[PDB]
């Protein structure tokens, strides 16, 4: 019942240029943004006018925006969460407000995979996945059945390259 597709907006050259000029003049759209740096790439999720992502990918960097570089409005190293004021065009999603344990993890590759809520910040995968299928999907949203944000994907628990559960930042903090 929840479905997603991706749309690319830049390649390497544009990406490197934009990092130095801190000025992304492309159209913004969508609920989840595919973010990149020099070293690594990952996701951001817009909730209540704020692009949220993970510190272990974004660090304390600005987000290249239309008017110029955007400072982080929120920065927590421990809980591995950072937020920028969302640029104009982003479609801001909304928190859960229902408590369903039936979750959906949206990946980097616009794949929606079933997740069982187990703890306050934990959920198990119903079908184990290769770790490479999940890599780069940090900051991707965990959705409730009606497609509201339960949390943001942070880390996975693995055994020999196959992930059997996910840890996420719960939405309440945001």
């Amino acid at each position: 019942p929840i479905t997603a597709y991706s749309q690319q907006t830049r390649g390497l050259l544009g990406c490197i240029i934009t990092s130095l000029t801190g000025r992304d003049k492309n159209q913004v759209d969508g609920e989840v943004q595919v973010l990149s740096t020099a070293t690594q790439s990952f996701l951001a999720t817009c909730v209540n006018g704020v692009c949220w992502t993970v510190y272990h990918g974004a660090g304390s960097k600005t987000l290249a925006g239309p008017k110029g570089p955007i400072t982080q409005m929120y920065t927590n190293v421990d809980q591995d969460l950072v937020g920028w004021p969302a640029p104009p065009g982003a479609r801001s999603m909304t928190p859960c407000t229902c408590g369903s344990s039936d979750l959906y993890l949206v990946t980097r590759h616009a794949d929606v995979i079933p997740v069982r809520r187990r703890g306050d910040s934990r959920g198990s995968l119903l079908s184990p996945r290769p770790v490479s299928y999940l890599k780069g999907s940090s900051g991707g949203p965990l959705l409730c059945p009606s497609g509201h944000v339960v949390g943001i994907f942070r880390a996975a628990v693995c055994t020999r390259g196959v992930a059997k559960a996910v840890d996420f930042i719960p939405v309440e903090s945001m």
Partner: peptide, 12 residues
Amino acid sequence: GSVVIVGRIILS
């Protein structure tokens, strides 16, 4: 060095 949007994902 700024983080850059290199794509988006649209949900429904």
